[PDB]
From a paper:
In this study, we investigate AfuABC (Actinobacillus ferric uptake ABC), a BPDT originally identified as an iron-specific transporter in Actinobacillus pleuropneumoniae, a Gram-negative upper respiratory tract pathogen. The locus afuABC encodes 3 polypeptides corresponding to a conventional BPDT–AfuA (a periplasmic binding protein or PBP), AfuB (an inner membrane permease), and AfuC (a cytosolic ATPase). AfuA is a class II/cluster D periplasmic binding protein with two globular α/β domains linked by a dual β-stranded hinge. Instead, AfuABC is a trio of proteins that bind and transport sugar-phosphates such as glucose-6-phosphate (G6P).
A subsequent ligand screen by ITC with structurally similar molecules revealed that three other sugar-phosphates including fructose-6-phosphate (F6P), sedoheptulose-7-phosphate (S7P) and M6P had affinities of 8, 57 and 960 nM respectively for AfuA. Structures of AfuA bound to F6P (2.0Å) and S7P (1.3Å) were also solved to confirm ligand coordination. Similar to the G6P structure, both F6P and S7P were found in the β-anomer conformation. F6P binding affinities of the single site AfuA mutants displayed the same trend as for G6P, suggesting a similar binding mechanism between the two ligands. Our observation that both furan (F6P and S7P) and pyran (G6P) ligands could bind AfuA suggests the position of hydroxyl determinants is more important than steric fitting of the overall ring structure into the binding pocket. On the opposing end of the pocket, redundant phosphate-coordinating residues such as Ser37 cooperate to hold the phosphate moiety of ligands.
Residue numbers in the entry: 0 to 318
């Protein structure tokens, strides 16, 4: 066993486990992970900043990792594999120097349980963000909570960029009566839509694509007004105990093999950032989508992330 590695993972358990096992088997490193939301994981790393408990932060959305970079929580390391990453996303965070790197892309949207829709007596599948404010969807939608979930923050930032911040919060307020719960995890609305516990889930479409691929009666929607996206992040923690192995993990996560195994074995259907990697047949093609130019440098920062989340809690979660 060539050393150890502790991962804070913010992707799904199945993806994290497959990455940790594939790394351990490829490189003989004793690898373990702890899984938590992108926002939850940031708070934990910030809290542990004097005596870091993990070596790398893998998966989840980029914005909290960018914020961690800004706050001095990360250790800069540019993997030679960055040369293979889509040039647009080679060094995308607020603070340059690859404190954080982009390992995948996820499209924000929603999906609809077409069988439950029918039971609600609704015949039209919603096609726009605006449709989700219709009163007939009372208690029939779920979205995550940005206090824990990177997905929820990606949505907030997407809406602020689309409509302007004030209209974004107006949207949250009109959406609110249709939300049955603000979920801790970004993926929970996908799971509950798949279950038919809810009719509409808002989140990253590859999660819905996997439920669909496994039989769920879901129709995925890229909303007609346009939408944003996540970059999945990988970052080394400042003070990492196993630095060398952390660098090796970053290499692997940015590698053709490390990215392909996410969809080949890890049941994770994000679009890959390594231009030499084979994409899943179910991965979204960004060139075909109505996407805003999501400003990672701007929203992966405290003056947006802490401000908007605290504002979201004040005006939406409370009143
Ligand atoms: O919203 P959360 O809980 O931080 O999780 C975000 C992550 O969940 C996923 O959608 C799971 O596939 C990831 O692509 C994304 O990075």
């Amino acid at each position: 066993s060539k050393g150890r590695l502790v991962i804070y993972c913010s992707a799904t358990n199945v993806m994290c486990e497959n990455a940790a096992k594939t790394f351990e088997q490829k490189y003989d490193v004793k690898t373990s992970f702890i899984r938590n939301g992108s926002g939850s994981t940031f708070a934990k790393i910030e809290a542990e900043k004097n005596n870091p408990q993990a070596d790398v932060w893998y998966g989840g959305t980029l914005d909290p990792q960018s914020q961690a970079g800004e706050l001095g929580l990360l250790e800069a390391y540019r993997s030679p594999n960055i040369d293979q990453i889509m040039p647009k996303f080679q060094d995308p965070a607020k603070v340059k120097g690859n404190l954080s790197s982009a390992v995948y892309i996820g499209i924000l949207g929603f999906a609809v349980n077409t069988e439950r829709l029918k039971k609600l007596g609704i015949e039209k599948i919603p096609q726009c963000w605006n449709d989700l404010t219709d009163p007939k969807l009372k208690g029939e939608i779920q979205i995550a909570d940005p206090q824990s979930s990177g997905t929820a923050y990606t949505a907030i930032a997407t809406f602020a960029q689309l409509w302007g911040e004030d209209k974004a919060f107006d949207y949250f307020k009109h959406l609110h009566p249709n939300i049955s719960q603000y979920t801790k995890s970004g993926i929970t609305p996908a799971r509950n839509a798949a279950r038919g516990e809810t009719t509409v889930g808002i989140g990253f479409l590859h999660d819905y694509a996997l439920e669909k691929e496994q039989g769920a009666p879901l129709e995925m929607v890229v909303p007609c007004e346009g939408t944003g996206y996540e970059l999945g992040g990988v970052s080394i923690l400042k003070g990492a105990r196993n630095l060398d192995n952390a660098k090796l993990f970053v290499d692997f996560a940015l590698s053709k093999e490390g990215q392909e195994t996410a969809w080949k074995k890890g049941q994770a259907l994000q679009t890959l950032t390594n231009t030499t990697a084979e994409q899943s047949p179910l991965a979204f093609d960004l060139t075909k989508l109505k996407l805003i130019d999501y400003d990672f440098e701007k929203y992966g920062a405290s003056d947006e992330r802490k401000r908007l989340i605290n504002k979201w809690v004040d005006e939406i979660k409370l009143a």
